[PDB]
Amino acid sequence: MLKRFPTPILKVYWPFFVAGAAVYYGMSKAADLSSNT
Amino acid sequence: SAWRKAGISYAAYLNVAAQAIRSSLKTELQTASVLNRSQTDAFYTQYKNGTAASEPTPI
Amino acid sequence: MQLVLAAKYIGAGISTIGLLGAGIGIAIVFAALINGVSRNPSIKDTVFPMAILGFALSEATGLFCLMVSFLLLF
Amino acid sequence: MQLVLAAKYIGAGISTIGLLGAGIGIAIVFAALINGVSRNPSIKDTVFPMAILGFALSEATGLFCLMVSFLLLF
Amino acid sequence: MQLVLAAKYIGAGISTIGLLGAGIGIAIVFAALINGVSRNPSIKDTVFPMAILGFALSEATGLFCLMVSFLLLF
Amino acid sequence: MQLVLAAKYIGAGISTIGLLGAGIGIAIVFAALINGVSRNPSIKDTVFPMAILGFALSEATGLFCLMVSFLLLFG
Amino acid sequence: MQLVLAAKYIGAGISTIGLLGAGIGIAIVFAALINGVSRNPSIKDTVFPMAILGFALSEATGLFCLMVSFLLLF
Amino acid sequence: MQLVLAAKYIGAGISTIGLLGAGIGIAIVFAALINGVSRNPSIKDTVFPMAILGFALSEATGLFCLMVSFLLLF
Amino acid sequence: MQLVLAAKYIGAGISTIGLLGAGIGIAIVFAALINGVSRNPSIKDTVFPMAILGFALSEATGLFCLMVSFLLLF
Amino acid sequence: SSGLKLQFALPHETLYSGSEVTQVNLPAKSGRIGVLANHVPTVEQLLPGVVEVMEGSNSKKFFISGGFATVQPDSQLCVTAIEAFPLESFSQENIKNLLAEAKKNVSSSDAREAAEAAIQVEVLENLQSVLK
Amino acid sequence: LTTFSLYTIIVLLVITSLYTLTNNNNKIIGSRWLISQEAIYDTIMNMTKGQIGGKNWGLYFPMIFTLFMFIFIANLISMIPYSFALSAHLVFIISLSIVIWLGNTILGLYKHGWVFFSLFVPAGTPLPLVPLLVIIETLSYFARAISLGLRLGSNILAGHLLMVILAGLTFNFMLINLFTLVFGFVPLAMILAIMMLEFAIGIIQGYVWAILTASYLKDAVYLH
Amino acid sequence: NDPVSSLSFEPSEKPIFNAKTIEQSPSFGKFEIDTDANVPRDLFEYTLANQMLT
Amino acid sequence: FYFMNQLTYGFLLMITLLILFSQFFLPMILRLYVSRLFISK
Structure with missing residues (x-):
């Protein structure tokens, strides 16, 4: 039913995750640069 | 009209057209040849080597 | 009236363009008529009035x- | 009237584009004519007057x- | 009088758009002509005269x- | 003296668009020539001169x- | 002065539209070429030189x- | 300078219209390619390259x- | 400045008019794919990626x- | 080849075996096409219609009962037929109409039989067009 | 808690109460809810074979599924005239397209390295044609990534505003006409039609987004 | 059996190309077929009828 | 502008959906598959 049979969750999904992290670093500085508040 | 799905095949369509021309041909054109063309007494048996014997199905 | 008459003239000139569509209408109606009659002579009699109505409209x-276009002129 | 005359000229220039459609339509009619006569040479006499009428239309x-355009100019 | 002459320049320039239709009409009549001749090598003697006539039209x-456009220019 | 040359340039530019139809018509003639040659390899001798005539025309x-457009520019 | 340059720029921009016909034409040439070579592969060798010739035209x-457009700009 | 840059922008906007013809042309080339390949699966290998090059240019x-349009902008 | 921004807006608007060809092109590409799958259903898997390629182009x-348009805007 | 030769043949007896012809009408599934000399090789289905054999003597006509109109690159026109329409003696209005009226009753008998009946009515109407 | 964040919480509240909160029949059927998602699950699973199949289609299946779920749910409840749908900014749809492309290349650069540059030259286009094609190919890679994000969000914005603009007209019509009848139900009829279109387009554009992001994954994993 | 002579005879063979392969003929291109009339299958059926009758 | 609790949270959402699908209902669909497979045999 919800019997957890292990499947790839992080083993092969790393590239998009590290891409997201590389986005995040800079993704907050873009708002800081264009504060306009 | 439709002779592939609605009909049987191009052969049947052509045969029916030929029978149209022959049966509707004028009286003086009627002869022994057109009578032989109209005449058909074949029997389709389809030998049941395994099964499905048609038993002398008329032409 | 200077600007008004100028705009009326250019409006008639630009409204003239519907004749493009009218001509293409008549033309491909007649072209399809020609193709059909050249591909079937018997159906010409029954396809001719339909083409007539088509290019009439x-x-x-x-x-x-x-x-x-004319009302913009007079 | 000076700007009126200028707008008359520009409006006539704009309105002169309908001959494009007229020519392209008569030419598609002729193309259908010649394709049909290439397929069936016997229908040429039958399609000649209908196609001439279509050309005129x-x-x-x-x-x-x-x-x-003439009304715009003179 | 610079504005009227400027506008007649503009109108003469606009009037040269019908070249599209004229050229495409010549194109389609000759295209259907060449297709009919290639598919029907024995139809040329009767398609060529009407093809030229349609081209002229x-x-x-x-x-x-x-x-x-020329009369607008001069 | 400036508006006249300005309108000369405008008229020439809006006249240049005429070559669009000429080019595409040339090429559609050529396309039908290609189609006819493909559907009849033996008709090339008959079809080439007429297609070239339509091209040049x-x-x-x-x-x-x-x-x-050129006389609008320099005349 | 500045009006002349402005109209020069707008005329060059309008002249740039002339490449659309060239694109559609070259592409229809290769389209017919593809259709013909797909019909009979043997025709490709005898059509390729004149095909690219019409392409270049x-x-x-x-x-x-x-x-x-360039001589308008310069 | 105001009108000069204004008409530079206008000319660039008019000039970028060539992508319309580019897209229509590459698409008719693709359409003919697909039609020929479906009608002739064997021709695919020898009809791919010049089709690719043709829609490329x-x-x-x-x-x-x-x-x-870029040079008009800059 | 105000005329500069005004011409920026109109140049963006007249830059927008080049994508009708893109729409028509992707459409005729998909139409040709439908036609080809109609003729040759088996070749659909091989022929599909070029449809998306032409769509992307x-x-x-x-x-x-x-x-x-956008560089003309902002 | 010099002109066109027609191999119009009928299973009872062949009609033409390569006779020189000035022009041939071939009512087909798409439409009639005039082939008279050279032309291109073609394969086509002959819909029931008047295959008129135009010749310098006369333009004698024949309504075909069906067949295939095919062409060879050597200016050969192989027209295979079954039953022709000799001149105008083939014309017989009364029995054609009688068959059409009597058998349109069974035009909805049984799928294949119904379709063949409708087709035979259609070719009878074609003959009526040839009846004139 | 901005409008985006609270909307995102509402998304997951709906997500769990379709298939996670049935879980009682111990069968493959027994609830038509289960038939619903497995239909969608099967349509994308076979699509995963047809587009990503050959070595690792099932490996990357969930991202296409999760993204399709994300777009599907965000487009369902987006019609009500007060739907302040996705903050009326939709900037994240651009962001999702950017990160999807940016992850796509790193996978390409990781799995191919310098070979990823060979993707710009599929079959021919020799050295005279190499610079032209690599310019078109590389610019295209930026091109469809940004286009994917903007087209979805703008149309949702376009659909939402054409809800309101037509709605204001109906308010004008029903207030001015005294005794006639054909003034407000026909504008109501378009409102009924234009709302079905907005509901419909979101479904397919979610599918289109699913197919597209699938399409770019092929190019990253497989060089052609 | 072929009636080669007025008294002699021997069996002989006539093969029929399938509709799936008459379209694969090397010379199939020179015929301007139309997909509307489904010429391959009609040709195959007519071919079968004629050769079996002969 | 505002991205903190949405994009990182978006990937966390994808991870949660990944769990609740691939660890729960992918095994469920597979389990019914193999269940009926052994039911036949």
């Missing part, structure tokens, strides 16, 4: 555009 | 564009 | 547009 | 408008 | 449009 | 129009 | 028009 649309 | 659009 | 619109 | 049709 | 029409 | 025509 | 044309 196309010319009616062209006349609508002509009327609109 | 298609060129009527160019004639209407001409009369509009 | 199509070019009538283009030459008339250029004539009205 | 549509080309002249476009070039006359090009000359109109 | 349509490209030359486009280049004429571009050159007129 | 059909897009290069629109790229030339875009470059004209 | 024509969309690239349309967004080149977008790039011109």
Whole structure:
């Protein structure tokens, strides 16, 4: 039913995750640069 | 009209057209040849080597 | 009236363009008629009035555009 | 009247585009004619007057564009 | 008088758009002609005269547009 | 003296669009030539000169408008 | 002065539209070429030189449009 | 300078229209390619390359129009 | 300044007019794929990727028009 | 080849075996096409219609009962037929109409039989067009 | 808690109460809810074979599924005239397209390295044609990534505003006309039609987004 | 059996190309077929009828 | 502008959906598959 049979969750999904992290670093500085508040 | 799905095949369509021309041909054109063309007494048996014997199905 | 008359003239000039569609209408109606009659002679008699009505309505649309262009002139 | 005359000229120039459609339509009619006669050479006599009528009707659009341009100019 | 002459320049420039239709009409008549000749090698002697006649009729619109552009210029 | 040359340039620029139809018409003639040659390899001798004539004729049709634009420019 | 340059720029921009016909034409040439070579592969060798010839002719029409636009600019 | 840059922007906007012709042309090339390949699966290998090149420079025509728009902008 | 921004707006608007060709092109590409699958259903898997390739190319044309329009805007 | 040769043949007896012809009408599924000399090789289905054999002597006509109109690159026209329409003696209005009226009753008998009945009515109407 | 964040919480509240909160029949059927998602699950699973199949289609299946779920749910409740749908900014749809492309290349650069640059030259286009094609190919890679994000969000914005603009007209019509009848139900009829279109387009554009992001994954994993 | 002579005879063979392969003929291109009339299958059926009758 | 609790949270959402699908209902669909497979045999 919800019997957890292990499947790839992080083993092969790393590239998009590290891409997201590389986005995040800079993704907050873009708002800081264009504060306009 | 439709002779592939609605009909049987191009052969049947052509045969029916030929029978149209022959049966509707004028009286003086009627002869022994057109009578032989109209005449058909074949029997389709389809030998049941395994099964499905048609038993002398008329032409 | 200077600007008004100028705009009326250019409006008639630009409203003239509906004759493009009227002509293409009549033209491909007649072209399809030619193709059909050349591919079947018997059906010519029953396809001719339909083409007649077709380019008649196309010319009616062209006349609508002509009327609109004309009212901008007078 | 000076700007009126200038707008008359520009509007006539704009209105002169209907001959494009008239010519392209008569030419598609002729193309259908010649394709049909290439397929069936026997229908040429039958399609000749109908196609001439279609040519006249298609060129009527160019004639209407001409009369509009003439009204714009003179 | 610079504005009227400027506008007649603009109108003469605009009038040269019918070249599209004239050229495409010549194109389609010759295209259908060449297709019919290739598919029917024995139809040329009767398609060539009407093909040329249709070409001339199509070019009538283009030459008339250029004539009205010329008279606007001069 | 400036508006006249300005309108000369405008008219020439709006006349240059005439070559569009001439080029595409030349090429559609050529396309039908290709189709006919493919559907009849033995008709090439008959079809090549007529197609070349149609080529040059549509080309002249476009070039006359090009000359109109040129006289708008330099005349 | 500045009005002349402004109209020069707008005229060059309008002249740039002349490449659309060249593109559509060269592409229809290769389209017919593809259809023909797909029909019979043997025709490709005898059509390729004249095919690219007509291709270059349509490209030359486009280049004429571009050159007129350039001489407008310069 | 105000009108000069204004008409530079207008000319660039008009010039970028070449991508319309580029897209239409590459698409008709693709359409003919698909039609021929479906009608002739064997021709695919020897009809791929010149089709690729042809729509490539059909897009290069629109790229030339875009470059004209670029120089108008800058 | 105000005329500069005004011409920026109109140049963006007239840059937008180059993507109708992109739409028509992607459409005729998909239409040709439908036609080819109709003729040759088996070749659909092989022939499909080129459809998306041509779609991407024509969309690239349309967004080149977008790039011109947007750079004209902001 | 010099002109066109027609191999019009009928299973009872062949009609033409390569006779020189000035022009041939071939009512087909798409439409009639005039082939008279050279032309291109073609394969086509002959819809029931008047295959008129135009010749310098006369333009004698024949309504075909069906067949295939195919062409060879050597200016050969192989027209295979079954039953022709000799001149105008083939014309017989009364029995054609009688068959059409009597058997349109069974035009909705049984799928294949119904379709063949409708087709035979259609070719009877074709004969009526040839009846004139 | 911005409008985006609270909307995102509402998304997951709906997500769990379709298939996670049935879980009682211990069968493959027994609830038509289960038939619903497995239909969608099967349509994308076979699509995963047809587009990504050959070595690792099932490996990357969930991202296409999760993204399709994300777009599907965000487009369902977006019609009500007060739907302040996705903050009326839709900037994240651009961000999702950017990160999807940016992850796509790193996978390409990781799995191919310098070979990823060979993707710009599929079959031919020799050295004279190499610079033209690599320019078109590389610019295209930026091109359809940004286009994917903007087209979805703008149309949702376009659909939402054409809800309101037509709605204001109906308010004008029903207030002015005294005794006639054909003034407000026909504008109501378009409102009924234009709302079905907006509901419909979101469904396919979610599918289109699913197919597209699938399409770019092929190019990253497989060089052609 | 072929009636080669007025008294002699021997069996002989006539093969029929399938509709799936008449379209694969090397010379199939020179015929301007139309997909509307489904010429391959009609040709195959007519071919079968004629050769079996002969 | 505002991205903190949405994009990182978006990937966390994808991870949660990944769990609740691939660890729960992918095994469920597979389990019914193999269940009926052994039911036949």
